[PDB]
Amino acid sequence: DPSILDSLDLNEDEREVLINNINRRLTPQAVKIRADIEVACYGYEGIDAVKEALRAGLNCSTENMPIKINLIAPPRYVMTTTTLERTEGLSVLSQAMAVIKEKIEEKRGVFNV
Amino acid sequence: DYTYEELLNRVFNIMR
Amino acid sequence: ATINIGTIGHVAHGKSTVVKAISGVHTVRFKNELERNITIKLGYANAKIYKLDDPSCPRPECYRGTKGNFKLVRHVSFVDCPGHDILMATMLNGAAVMDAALLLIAGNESCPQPQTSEHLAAIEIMKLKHILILQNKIDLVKESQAKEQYEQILAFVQGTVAEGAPIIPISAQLKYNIEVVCEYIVKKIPVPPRDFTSEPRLIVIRSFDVNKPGCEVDDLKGGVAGGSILKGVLKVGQEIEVRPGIVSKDSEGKLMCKPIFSKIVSLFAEHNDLQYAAPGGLIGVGTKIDPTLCRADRMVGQVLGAVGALPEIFTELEISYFLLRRLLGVRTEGDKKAAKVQKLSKNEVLMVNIGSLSTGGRVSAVKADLGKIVLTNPVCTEVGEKIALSRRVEKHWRLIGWGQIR
């Protein structure tokens, strides 16, 4: 983050510190969170909406970057969130509640927190 | 039932 | 997928060699804690039935008995029966709208054989007409037992219809006479008539699941089940309605029954999937919908219709019935002549195999020949000529009654 790193470079730049020491102890802190989903829908607007549930899986795969949805819980799956940024949280919340606030009610389905 | 005597000769004379 | 022949298996045959002689090998099957093996179920085959200008019907290599350039046209099918004498009553559920029957006789057990016509005891109401005489003792005790035993088994054929195809004395471990057995089940067993251009239907029997962990969310997923056709031939990609489907809970009206249809992809056919559903066997139906509803184990016992179908489905039931005046076939002289079959009591569990779906039977009012019942879940209307009432009399089930929709 100070990539202007000059003014007594000791060495070439920081030699013994930057071989492992500067790099060696970043000490990043993060806490695992696992915000869930439960969407489904039924009907023939529900067949359109179960196509739209599968593309909702596609949609929280590719649009707003929730990453690596796995298939371990056979009724309903998970979407991941890990702090390297922490500002993925409000974006994921805004989009999941935009899903519940405009997406599902136009297609007459069931979903909550 | 001729099939039975067919067995009785050939099957049991050659195989179990 | 061509023939739903039945089989009646009592104790201690050696069953994988005879069934795999007439079905090839076992399917890859899965998801343990299944359903109890005295309930409704179906068979399958990984083979086909054909000939090679030959009594022998081998497995699909074209030379090894000799040549004969096999007809890759159809595939044989089958209906399961494991080798214990318990396999009576669910088979008699299955002995109504199947195609034919095997008939299994051993010599390992009692030679004045008790179980076979103890097993085969609906030769009047439903269909039981195409059988074979099949001795399973060439192994332990030789020609004296078989000598008296052919008189034993021809003492069966008189009014009890036990003469559909004569004796085959084998042990299927040798796989012997399967050239002759296959010649019998090609020629001496016919194929009954069907309908073709009828609007197709299905009641769901054996559900599955195809979303084991480890894939992506962009996969095509859905609800795969099992079934077999009663009418029509079912193509791919149309309005495939399931009429109540889910139990419509807190349903306050009549038009509050939900319009739910689907599409279809997989129709498993041993090597392929012919998208027009080939009847006469287990069909591998897989639905388009991606719910928690059908692709779980939640769905057994619902219809396959179309938009604007005929049956309206509610609970208003009244049935006309009668009974069986002993436990059917069982008569053991060592203190078993009081296996009593008691009249329909009020509020008693049953099994009402209306058509080919197992729902437990509850009852509400008892007359001598008719009864007003209410049932454990909403159940479609299939047929009035048979309502196969079964009832607890022992550790497992036995069938007790015959019914009529009123």
Swiss-Prot record, chain A:
Source organism's superkingdom? Eukaryota
* PTM comment: Substrate for at least 4 kinases: EIF2AK1/HRI, EIF2AK2/PKR, EIF2AK3/PERK and EIF2AK4/GCN2.
Localization per record: Cytoplasm, Stress granule; Cytoplasm, Cytosol; Mitochondrion
The conditions that induce or repress this protein are given as: Up-regulated upon endoplasmic reticulum stress.
What family name appears in the similarity comment? Answer: Belongs to the eIF-2-alpha family.
- Give the multimer and partner information: Eukaryotic translation initiation factor 2 eIF2 is a heterotrimeric complex composed of an alpha (EIF2S1), a beta (EIF2S2) and a gamma (EIF2S3) chain. eIF2 is member of the 43S pre-initiation complex (43S PIC). eIF2 forms a complex with at least CELF1/CUGBP1, CALR, CALR3, EIF2S1, EIF2S2, HSP90B1 and HSPA5. Interaction with METAP2 protects EIF2S1 from inhibitory phosphorylation. Interacts with ABCF1 isoform 2. Associates with ribosomes. Interacts with DDX3X in an RNA-independent manner. Interacts with CDC123.
Q: What does this protein do?
A: Member of the eIF2 complex that functions in the early steps of protein synthesis by forming a ternary complex with GTP and initiator tRNA. This complex binds to a 40S ribosomal subunit, followed by mRNA binding to form a 43S pre-initiation complex (43S PIC). Junction of the 60S ribosomal subunit to form the 80S initiation complex is preceded by hydrolysis of the GTP bound to eIF2 and release of an eIF2-GDP binary complex. In order for eIF2 to recycle and catalyze another round of initiation, the GDP bound to eIF2 must exchange with GTP by way of a reaction catalyzed by eIF2B.
Question: What's the protein here called?
Answer: Eukaryotic translation initiation factor 2 subunit 1
Please name the gene that encodes this protein: EIF2S1
Part of the full-length chain shown: 159 to 271 of 315
Swiss-Prot record, chain B:
Q: Which family does this protein fall into?
A: Belongs to the eIF-2-beta/eIF-5 family.
Q: Gene encoding it?
A: EIF2S2
- Residue ranges annotated as transmembrane are none
From the Swiss-Prot or TrEMBL record, give the protein name: Eukaryotic translation initiation factor 2 subunit 2
Entry function: Component of the eIF2 complex that functions in the early steps of protein synthesis by forming a ternary complex with GTP and initiator tRNA. This complex binds to a 40S ribosomal subunit, followed by mRNA binding to form the 43S pre-initiation complex (43S PIC). Junction of the 60S ribosomal subunit to form the 80S initiation complex is preceded by hydrolysis of the GTP bound to eIF2 and release of an eIF2-GDP binary complex. In order for eIF2 to recycle and catalyze another round of initiation, the GDP bound to eIF2 must exchange with GTP by way of a reaction catalyzed by eIF2B.
Subunit-structure text: Eukaryotic translation initiation factor 2 eIF2 is a heterotrimeric complex composed of an alpha (EIF2S1), a beta (EIF2S2) and a gamma (EIF2S3) chain. eIF2 is member of the 43S pre-initiation complex (43S PIC). eIF2 forms a complex with at least CELF1/CUGBP1, CALR, CALR3, EIF2S1, EIF2S2, HSP90B1 and HSPA5. EIF2S2 interacts with BZW2/5MP1. EIF2S2 interacts with EIF5. Interacts with CDC123. Interacts with methionyl-initiator methionine tRNA. (Microbial infection) Interacts with Aichi virus (AiV) leader protein.
Give the location in the cell.
Answer: Cytoplasm, Cytosol
Swiss-Prot record, chain C:
The subunit structure is: Eukaryotic translation initiation factor 2 eIF2 is a heterotrimeric complex composed of an alpha (EIF2S1), a beta (EIF2S2) and a gamma (EIF2S3) chain. eIF2 is member of the 43S pre-initiation complex (43S PIC). Interacts (via C-terminus) with CDC123; the interaction is direct.
Region G1, residue ranges: 9-16
Which domain of life, per UniProt?
Answer: Eukaryota
| Region ranges (G2) | 37-41
Q: What else is known?
A: Encoded by an chromosome X-linked gene which escapes inactivation. Does not have any homolog on chromosome Y.
Q: In which tissues is it expressed?
A: Expressed in testis, brain, liver and muscle.
**Could you tell me which PANTHER family the record lists for this protein?**
EUKARYOTIC TRANSLATION INITIATION FACTOR 2 SUBUNIT 3 FAMILY MEMBER (PTHR42854), EUKARYOTIC TRANSLATION INITIATION FACTOR 2 SUBUNIT 3-RELATED (PTHR42854:SF3)
Record Gene3D superfamilies: P-loop containing nucleotide triphosphate hydrolases, Translation factors
Q: Where does the protein end up?
A: Cytoplasm, Cytosol
Catalytic class of the enzyme: hydrolase
One GO cellular component term: extracellular exosome
Region (G4) location: 136-139
- Give the classification, highest ranks: Eukaryota, Metazoa, Chordata, Craniata, Vertebrata
Q: Which residues bind GTP?
A: 12-17, 136-139, 171-173
Query: Which Enzyme Commission numbers does its entry carry?
Result: 3.6.5.3
Role according to the record: Member of the eIF2 complex that functions in the early steps of protein synthesis by forming a ternary complex with GTP and initiator tRNA. This complex binds to a 40S ribosomal subunit, followed by mRNA binding to form the 43S pre-initiation complex (43S PIC). Junction of the 60S ribosomal subunit to form the 80S initiation complex is preceded by hydrolysis of the GTP bound to eIF2 and release of an eIF2-GDP binary complex. In order for eIF2 to recycle and catalyze another round of initiation, the GDP bound to eIF2 must exchange with GTP by way of a reaction catalyzed by eIF-2B.
The name on file for this protein is Eukaryotic translation initiation factor 2 subunit 3
Keyword annotations: Acetylation, Cytoplasm, Disease variant, Epilepsy, GTP-binding, Hydrolase, Initiation factor, Intellectual disability, Nucleotide-binding, Obesity, Phosphoprotein, Protein biosynthesis
Q: Where is the tr-type G domain?
A: 1-194
Region (G3), start-end ranges: 80-83
